[PDB]
Symmetry: D2
Subunit: 159 residues, 4 copies
């Protein structure tokens, strides 16, 4: 009785969500019962805030794709339960916040995942490989596109 | 410039990976353009030399259909342009193609993606006339 | 600053150390100043903050079994901020599949992260976890074989 | 008829051989009967002669496979006998010209990966090989 967990991290603008739908479409086109979840009020996928709300619903599905997984506090127990019930869990999440500090409870999922990959963005200042996200406003994050965030490399993140 | 090459059987996601790699540059204020058999529909790649002269990022989908794929991609990468190609590596008989192999010794990055077998639900790496299958299901 | 951090994780018997010396030999064969560190040819230390002064003249730093070094985090960042390339091969999870928090705190700071797989020693499929019973007391297993034992 | 083929290409000094023995060590440490071939390990020039010998092995690793003329027939025949075949070969010559049958093996391979070296001129990403000894270079330096 075994599933697995695929983990996709990376900075903003690196394409995590698109890679998520590629892996999901791989199974869905092979007649898998696929469902996708994303975090509501972000800016065919379900929009929820707590994963404990959909624990009962997706019992009949074999493929679970989750976008913006760092926002779900119960992401780890959820993925472990589904992976132990024979379901394939694919997660696209941020590894670090704007302060390059760990995001919520998303790292505790790596000792439980079968595959972990980090994608790269393009730096919007020195047009090199970006691996960090940097907010442009004055708050201390807040969700947004590129108007307030930019994907940068190591040298451009510190001034 | 350089050449990124993405191969794999049908239903493996080559086109989606193509647009991901292209969108990475496009979001960084690159002048990006895409070609299929911003968007272009052509039959011969030697015909589009004039159009994309002002572009730095070139994406090509279903590159095996272009007979001059090998000369075109190099004759674009040697002018500082980034070329990202999503193409099939093998025909229905898992036989070599006319002139898509000759592009790999010139590419800087080459990756082969996998599909899901539509018969035995395992890893798929071949195409059969359509269904994507593995080795056991291809020669059952 | 000018450097970066490459992170190689995976269970035991997945080949992390071999991949480490491959990535280093790529730079070393290009006349880079490389140095390698291991836990107590490569230096053998217990605290990484002792060799901060020593390896100042090196551009490539490879570390094996990074989970054992408590100061792994503040080390790699400092080295990466001095223009140095830092390559780490460490375990992601213990035998209880619990995090090596010192290692996990390095991922939001790393430029590259990859997880390698081993081969299951019970049902011979892909393995991503380590279990206790040297090799005669550890085994690389998959999810199904980790719980059913 | 239930095996597969893993393919490793790249220029010189990219680490293809080290990756080869890493992938083989993965299986060998899991009590697989592994054997390695170069131009327990055998050293031969034609692969079609050792078909009978390695019948009891499930994992076959080949290095510098471009030098074996019968690499394709061998890898297909061996993969169709439940054996895992891992090949590490050069993708391009010193003239950036295609290889004899290494490419004709890609439509038959289950996994294909290309590794990169470090440029020995501008210390950037290298993907090509050049002659003087030998050096791994990028596009601009070639
Ligand atoms: C950097 C950062 C972002 N956010 C927010 C902003 C983002 O919209 C959201 C998650 O962003 P993502 O959806 O991961 O970024 P993206 O979808 O635009 O990039 P891609 O699809 O290519 O992977 O989280 C925070 O809440 N805190 C932070 O520190
Ligand atoms: Zn930058
Ligand atoms: Zn099949
Ligand atoms: Zn097992
Ligand atoms: Zn160079």
């Amino acid at each position: 009785n075994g599933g697995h967990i695929q983990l996709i991290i990376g900075p903003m603008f690196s394409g995590k969500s698109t890679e998520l739908i590629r892996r999901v479409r791989r199974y869905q086109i092979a007649q898998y019962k696929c469902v996708t979840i994303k975090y509501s009020n972000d800016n065919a996928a379900l929009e929820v805030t707590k994963l404990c709300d959909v624990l009962e619903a997706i019992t009949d599905f074999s493929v679970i794709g989750i976008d913006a997984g760092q926002f779900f506090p119960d992401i780890v127990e959820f993925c472990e339960r589904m992976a132990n019930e024979g379901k394939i869990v694919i997660v696209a999440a941020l590894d670090g916040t704007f302060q390059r500090r760990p995001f919520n409870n998303i790292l505790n999922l790596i000792p439980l995942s079968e595959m972990v990959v980090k994608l790269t963005a393009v730096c919007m200042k020195c047009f090199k490989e970006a691996s960090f996200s940097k907010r442009l406003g004055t708050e201390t994050e807040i969700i947004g596109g590129n108007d307030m965030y930019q994907s940068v490399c190591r040298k451009c993140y510190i001034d």
